[PDB]
Amino acid sequence: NWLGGLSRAAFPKRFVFGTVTSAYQVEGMAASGGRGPSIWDAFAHTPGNVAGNQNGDVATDQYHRYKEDVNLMKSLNFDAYRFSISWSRIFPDGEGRVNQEGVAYYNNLINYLLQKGITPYVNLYHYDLPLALEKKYGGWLNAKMADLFTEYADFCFKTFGNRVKHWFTFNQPRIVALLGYDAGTNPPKRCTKCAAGGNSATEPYIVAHNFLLSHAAAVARYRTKYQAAQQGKVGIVLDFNWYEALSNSTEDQAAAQRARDFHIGWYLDPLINGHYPQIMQDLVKDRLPKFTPEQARLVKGSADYIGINQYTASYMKGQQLMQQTPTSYSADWQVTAVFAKNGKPIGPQANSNWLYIVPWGMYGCVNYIKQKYGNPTVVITENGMDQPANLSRDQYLRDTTRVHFYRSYLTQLKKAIDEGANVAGYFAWSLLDNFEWLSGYTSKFGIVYVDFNTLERHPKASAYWFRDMLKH
């Protein structure tokens, strides 16, 4: 069957199914409704930064159309919706004055979701640092971010937490560190070569450390001030793509494990165990910040659940670990990613060049976290694939590859859960075609098609697949 035996009965009782968006990628009204600019507004408005010089000024206009979109997700039998709050829509300068119109938007969205029986899962941050904070403080390079973020989090807890019971602090701090401060291809465009300045060997580590400390501080505030009354939960969202040793050699198995540690362990070892992975300590040395005992105790156990964004997989090839002059976070791993084995590609690519369709990577990642980290509560917070630009409406709607993608990946997730993985939910990226960062509107991740001329929504085949699979 096109469902391939999948249904709600195939997953645990009360397992949560949802869809996901992020504020800058879908809201629009970027310079309206009192919203202050984020680092992404400045970046996207700079010629050459985004495909077609596009930006999120309008995006999908969810700001005006949110009731349509909530009605749609309910009609598709989802239980939950993961979305983010734009920090600069609430605090235009990132601190100080509250934009009441911004608060009203999120109140209206949250209240409508609840009215329609859809549980809000709310990210506080999804790349969209208020521009004022980047300029005034230097953003995530400044340890002061922990205070600034905690104050923002506190406001959101006080204002929405009587209704919102499932929070996340950050989204993919690895990608912020990597693209923002190693490669310099996402804002603030810092790197060793870069015009904005930077240092690809040091700054990614500073940035990751500050995300961890900020997360911990916000959760401490939640727990000491709000949790008794509100009885909700706060986690964090981390990207994890699977790494499989290219061969069974000692060097290749070591390489795969080293890649896992530099990718997910970077955040999970502090969050679960109260220290950075040993291999990162050994190789990165003085460039890896040291948690004080007090900080390590604040960070350890500070996530009520682990959000995992799972998309793809690669093989890893190793070599002799060698003494080398530091150049970058990326180079620190001392591995080589490989995308074929025995002359066969690991999987076909979706529109995004990085996205190889490898359903067994989902099993790989979930099983690994179960076995390595004491089976913490995991929520699959993003999973999905993209179509290319310039197709017809009907070609977008007949998204057979995406149907196959979800069936295959969810079957692999089911396999891991049946083997005892503590997975509490799954969220499809994305509800809607949207603004896909550097790709702008040239990458289509939605289960719902968005016509970017008219802004009309049209559910794709994959949307109806979910509707069938999820019927109560």
Ligand X SMILES: OC[C@H]1O[C@@H](O[C@H]2[C@H](O)[C@@H](O)[C@H](O[C@H]3[C@H](O)[C@@H](O)[C@H](O[C@H]4[C@H](O)[C@@H](O)[C@H](O)O[C@@H]4CO)O[C@@H]3CO)O[C@@H]2CO)[C@H](O)[C@@H](O)[C@@H]1O
Taking only Cα atoms into account, the Rg of the chain, rounded to an integer number of angstroms, comes to 21
Distance of CA 446 to the CA centre of its chain: 15
The yes or no reply on residue 333 touching ligand X (CB under 6 A) is: yes
> At its nearest, how many Å lie between ligand X and the CB of residue 360?
15
Report the interface residues with Zn ion, using CB under 5 A: 61, 64
List beta partners, residue 237.
171, 307
Output phi, psi for 448, to 5 deg: -115, 125
Q: Which of Zn ion, ligand X, none lies near 88, with the C-beta cut-off 5 to 8 A by kind?
A: none
> Which residue in the set 296, 351, 464, 470 belongs to the binding site for ligand X (CB under 6 A)?
464
H or E element at residue 64: helix 62-75
The yes or no reply on residue 383 touching ligand X (CB under 6 A) is: no
Q: Which of Zn ion, ligand X, none lies near 61, with the C-beta cut-off 5 to 8 A by kind?
A: Zn ion
CB contact set of 108 (below 8 Å; sequence gap of 6+): 66
Q: Which of ligand X, Zn ion, none lies near 299, with the C-beta cut-off 5 to 8 A by kind?
A: none
Tokens representing 318? 């190793």
Of 305 and 445, nearer to ligand X (C-beta) is 445
Q: Which amino acid is at 240?
A: F
The string over 122-151, giving b where at least 16 C-beta atoms fall within 10 Å of a residue's C-beta and e elsewhere, is: bbbbbbbbbbbbbeebebbbbeebbebbbb
d(CA 1, CA 10): 14
Q: Which of Zn ion, ligand X, none lies near 337, with the C-beta cut-off 5 to 8 A by kind?
A: ligand X
Tokens representing 192? 């060793």
Q: Which of Zn ion, ligand X, none lies near 468, with the C-beta cut-off 5 to 8 A by kind?
A: ligand X
- Is residue 136 left, alpha or beta, with left meaning phi > 0 and alpha meaning psi from -120 to 50? alpha
Q: How far is it between the farthest Cα atoms of the chain?
A: 60
Residue closest to ligand X when measured from CB atoms: 1
Of 227 and 336, nearer to ligand X (C-beta) is 336
The yes or no reply on residue 149 touching ligand X (CB under 6 A) is: no
> Which residue in the set 75, 340, 354, 374 belongs to the binding site for ligand X (CB under 6 A)?
354
Residues 268-307 that bind ligand X (CB under 6 A): none
> Which residue in the set 51, 337, 391, 455 belongs to the binding site for ligand X (CB under 6 A)?
337
Per DSSP, the three-state class of 289 is: coil
The yes or no reply on residue 338 touching ligand X (CB under 6 A) is: no
> At its nearest, how many Å lie between ligand X and the CB of residue 455?
19
Residues 417-446 that bind ligand X (CB under 6 A): 429, 436-437, 445
Distance of CA 146 to CAs 195, 211, 401, Å?
27, 8, 42
Which residue is listed with tokens 């362990």?
A: 265
> Which residue in the set 38, 99, 172, 302 belongs to the binding site for ligand X (CB under 6 A)?
172
The yes or no reply on residue 312 touching ligand X (CB under 6 A) is: yes
Evaluated on CA atoms 327, 332, 338, 341, the torsion sign reads positive
Of 60 and 334, nearer to Zn ion (C-beta) is 60
The yes or no reply on residue 454 touching ligand X (CB under 6 A) is: no
Residues lying near ligand X in the complex (CB under 6 A) are found at: 1-2, 22, 25, 171-172, 175, 178, 239, 241, 309, 311-312, 314, 330, 333, 335, 337, 354, 382, 429, 436-437, 445, 461, 464, 468
